[PDB]
Design a protein around this ligand. Structure first.
Ligand SMILES: OC1NC=Nc2cccc(F)c21
Ligand SMILES: OC1NC=Nc2cccc(F)c21
Lengths: 212, 207
C-alpha cells in the first residue's frame, strides 16, 4: 500500500516515530525521509542562493531538487510542495490523496524553491502546491507532518463540534449538562445541534456563509 | 523570556522542535507526558462521552491536575482543537510577546469542556484550529503553533509569486528576463502582477 517520500534538509525533524498516528500505520504505509543534501556535489553542500531580481533571503536551487526528484519520483507520483502561496489543503484534499499509491513531499524554506522545479516536474507527473494555513512557517517540514497525519488517518485500514463531557458528572462544582445524562437520544441530538450552532456562529461564521 | 510548556500523551513527538540560544534566556520549551497526572495503574486519560457517540473524551480530573501544576495566573493556555477560533498570523504575533504559553494537546474528540471553562476563570484560555482538515490529535497543531510563534521571537493581502535563482537557464527554462534588467521599479510591478494572477488562481478568497 501507500508510499510516502519526504525530501528535506532537516531529516531528523521528520523522523517517523512509533507512538504516532503515522507510526501505527507504519508498523499499511511506508514513510521514507531523505536528506536533500544527499544530491549536492560541492564541498559546502549548498542548496540555496540569492534570488534573481533581488529581495530578502535565499531561494532553493533548482539543480539539487531536480536531481533529487529525478531519482525519487515516477510518472505515477503525486508531488506535493507545501508553500504559503499554494492552493488550500482541505479535508477534501486529504480524502483525495488518501487513495494515492505514491506521495512525494518536497519541503522547502518559506522563500521557496525555484519555480522551475515545480514547472519541470509538471511535465512528467502531477504536482500540487498547497498551504495548510495563513500563518507563517519557516519551512515546509511542519506542513508535511500535518499533511501526512490528515491523509494517513483516511487510508483504508460544515459545522463545528460542540462541547464534550465525560465522568464524573460533577467536577469542581461544574455539572455535565443534564440532557447528556438523560439517555434521550432525540433531546441529546437537539441540544448538540444547538451547541454546535452557537459555536460555529461565534467562532467560524464563514462555515455557514457569513462574514468573518 | 518565553517559556512554553506542552502537555501531551505523545511526548517523543514533540521533542524534535532543536532551536537556538536558550543560554540567553530567550526561549525554553518543556514537554510533559500527560500520564504523569493519571490516577490509576492503567494510566487512563480518556473515557466514554456523556450522551453517547463514538470516540473518547479526555478526562477532566487528569487534565485539571496537570494544568493546576503547570499553569499560573499569567499563563496563556492554548488548546488546539478543530472547533477552535482560527489560528492566524495575527494570533502568532500576539502570542510571541507572552511570558508563558501552555499548550494542551488533546485528541480530536476533545478534552472535557469543564477543563477549559474552569481554567478560564483564573487565566486566559484560547481554543484554536490551524485548519479545516482533520487530525487525530493536537500534537501536529502544537508543532505548527510553536513554529509560527517562535520565529517571531527575535533571535530564534496577496500571495508571493514565483522566485528564481541560479543558473539563468535550467532544463530549457530561462529566468524571466525582467529580473535581470536592473530596472527595479519594473521588477516590483512585474512581481505585483504575478502576485495578482497567482492570488486570483489559487486564493480568490483573499480578494
Ligand atoms: O502552508 C504553509 N503556511 C505557512 N508557511 C509555510 C512555509 C513552508 C511551507 C508551507 F506549506 C507553509
Ligand atoms: O483536526 C484538527 N484540525 C485543526 N486543528 C486541530 C487542532 C487540534 C486537534 C485537531 F484534531 C485539529
Amino acid at each position: 500500500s501507500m508510499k510516502i517520500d519526504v525530501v528535506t534538509i532537516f531529516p531528523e525533524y521528520l523522523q517517523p516515530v512509533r507512538q504516532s498516528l503515522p507510526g501505527k500505520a507504519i508498523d499499511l504505509v511506508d514513510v521514507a525521509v531523505h536528506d536533500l543534501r544527499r544530491w549536492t556535489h560541492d564541498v559546502h553542500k549548498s542548496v540555496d542562493d540569492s534570488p534573481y531580481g533581488g529581495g530578502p533571503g535565499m531561494v532553493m536551487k533548482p539543480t539539487v531538487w531536480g536531481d533529487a526528484l529525478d531519482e525519487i519520483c515516477t510518472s505515477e507520483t503525486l508531488l506535493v510542495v507545501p508553500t504559503p502561496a499554494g492552493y488550500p489543503f482541505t479535508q477534501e484534499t486529504a480524502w483525495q490523496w488518501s487513495t494515492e499509491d505514491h506521495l512525494v513531499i518536497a519541503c522547502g524554506r518559506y522563500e521557496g524553491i525555484d519555480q522551475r522545479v515545480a514547472d519541470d516536474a509538471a511535465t512528467r507527473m502531477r504536482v500540487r502546491e498547497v498551504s495548510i494555513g495563513d500563518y507563517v512557517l519557516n519551512g515546509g517540514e511542519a506542513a508535511a507532518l500535518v499533511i501526512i497525519e490528515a491523509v494517513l488517518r483516511l487510508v483504508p485500514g460544515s459545522l463545528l463540534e460542540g462541547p464534550s463531557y465525560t465522568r464524573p458528572p460533577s467536577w469542581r462544582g461544574m455539572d455535565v449538562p443534564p440532557v447528556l445524562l438523560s439517555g434521550d437520544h432525540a433531546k441529546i441530538a437537539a441540544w448538540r445541534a444547538e451547541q454546535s450552532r452557537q459555536r460555529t456562529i461565534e467562532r467560524r461564521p464563514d462555515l455557514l456563509g457569513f462574514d468573518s
